[PDB]
Amino acid sequence: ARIRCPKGSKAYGSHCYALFLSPKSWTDADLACQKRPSGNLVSVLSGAEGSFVSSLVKSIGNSYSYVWIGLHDPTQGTEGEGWEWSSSDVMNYFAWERNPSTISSPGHCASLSRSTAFLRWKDYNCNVRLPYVCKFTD
Ligand SMILES: [Zn+2]
Ligand SMILES: [Zn+2]
Ligand SMILES: [Zn+2]
């Protein structure tokens, strides 16, 4: 109604968000998020949502510099329009630190980078285990 979420997550818009510190590869993180109702690694569909997600993670801590979000490229470079959100939302907002199309052999998953105050996206090796943010409904 006035948007409430489960203990352990935060509301924004019509969604609940939760940061998990025990690191997982991109695929394992998204699968973990899917345990939740309409859950998936967070999709960032507006600058406003980007700022909110940023505030959610800013206090993670020195040990972590990258956090998984739900953007990946199933074409593994062969496409650079192969990127998509695991939630299947239309890619209507773009916040790359450096566009992957300017990178030779970029990572095929995207993470929020501490260098950009977690407001921008960095191509990253999908197999690396990182903390991650889930976006779901309650
Ligand atoms: Zn949803
Ligand atoms: Zn996909
Ligand atoms: Zn590659």
From Swiss-Prot:
Transmembrane segments: none annotated. Residues 68-81 are annotated as: Sufficient to activate EXTL3. Zn(2+) binds at H15, H72, E84, H108. Disulfide bonds join C5-C16, C33-C134, C109-C126. Forms a hexameric membrane-permeabilizing oligomeric pore on membrane phospholipids. The hexamer is formed by three dimers related by helical symmetry. Forms filaments, filamentation traps pore complexes and limits damage to host cells. Interacts with EXTL3. Bactericidal C-type lectin which acts exclusively against Gram-positive bacteria and mediates bacterial killing by binding to surface-exposed carbohydrate moieties of peptidoglycan. Binds membrane phospholipids and kills bacteria by forming a hexameric membrane-permeabilizing oligomeric pore. This is Regenerating islet-derived protein 3-alpha 15 kDa form. It comes from Homo sapiens. The gene is REG3A. The chain holds residues 36 to 175 of 175 of the full protein.
